Amino acid sequence: ELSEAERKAVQAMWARLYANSEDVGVAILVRFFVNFPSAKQYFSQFKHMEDPLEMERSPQLRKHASRVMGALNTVVENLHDPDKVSSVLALVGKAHALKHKVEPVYFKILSGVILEVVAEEFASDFPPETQRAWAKLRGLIYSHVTAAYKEVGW
Ligand code: HEM
Ligand SMILES: [Xe]
Ligand SMILES: [Xe]
Ligand SMILES: [Xe]
Ligand SMILES: [Xe]
C-alpha cells in the first residue's frame, strides 16, 4: 500500500512534528474539540469546557494528546513491519470500542484535523506525493480501527 518513498516522506515529516510532539498534539486536540464539541462528551475533566485557552491547560486533554502521539509514533516508525502496526491499531480500536465506547466516526474526524494541521505546519514541503502518503496512512488507520470495532461487536 504505502511505497518506500511515501513511507520515508511520512517518517521524515513525523520526526519534524515529534520534536514538539507536546505542543503539536494538544494543538490538534484543542482544534478537534473546539470544532467538534460533541467529541468532548467522552472526557470527564473537560466535557463542559468551551474555552480553548482552558482546554490547552487541561491535564486530561494533555494526557490524551501525549498518548495519541505515542500510539501513532509506534505506527509511523514501524510502517515497514505490517504486524506491529496491526497490533497497535487493534489494541487502540478495541480499547476505544469497549473501554471508552467512542463512536468510530470520531476517528475519521480526528484524522481529518490531524491532516489539516500537518498541511499547515509543512505547507512549504507538501507536494502531491507527500499528500498521497499521508492520505494512505490516514486510510490505513481507519481500516484497522474499523476492523477492530467489528471484531468486538460494534
Ligand atoms: C488516532 C486516534 C486515537 C488514538 C491513537 C488514541 C489512543 C488512546 C490511548 C493510547 C489511550 C490510553 C489507553 C486507553 O485508555 O485506551 C486513550 C484513552 C482515551 N481515549 Fe483515545 N485515541 C484516539 C482517538 C480518540 C477519539 C477520537 C476519542 C473520542 C472522541 C478518544 C477517547 C478516549 C478516551 C475517553 C480515553 C480515556 C481517557 C482517560 O482515561 O482520561 N480517543 N486513547
Ligand atoms: Xe493528537
Ligand atoms: Xe499519524
Ligand atoms: Xe500529528
Ligand atoms: Xe492521520
Q: Resolution in A, one decimal?
A: 2.4
Q: Which three cell numbers stand for residue 5?
A: 518513498
- How many CA atoms lie less than 13 Å away from 20 in the CB half-sphere? 7
Alpha carbon distance 130, 66 (integer Å) = 25
Q: Is the CB of 115 under 6 A from ligand 1?
A: no
Alpha carbon distance 152, 154 (integer Å) = 6
Experimental method: X-ray
Ligand with the closest atom to the CA of 108: 1
Q: Specify whether the CB–CB gap between 118 and 72 falls below 8 A.
A: no
Residue type, 134: W
- What's the 50 CA to ligand 4 centre distance in angstroms? 23
Residue type, 59: P
Q: Pocket residues for ligand 4 (CB within 6 Å)? A: 17, 24, 28, 114, 118
Q: Is the CB of 118 under 6 A from ligand 3?
A: no
Q: Which three cell numbers stand for residue 97?
A: 470500542
What is the architecture of the domain spanning 1-154? Orthogonal Bundle (1.10)
> What residues contact 137, with CB distance under 8 A and at least 6 apart?
2, 10, 75, 76, 79
Reading phi first (left if > 0) and then psi (alpha if -120 to 50, else beta), residue 153 is in left
Alpha carbon distance 11, 109 (integer Å) = 22
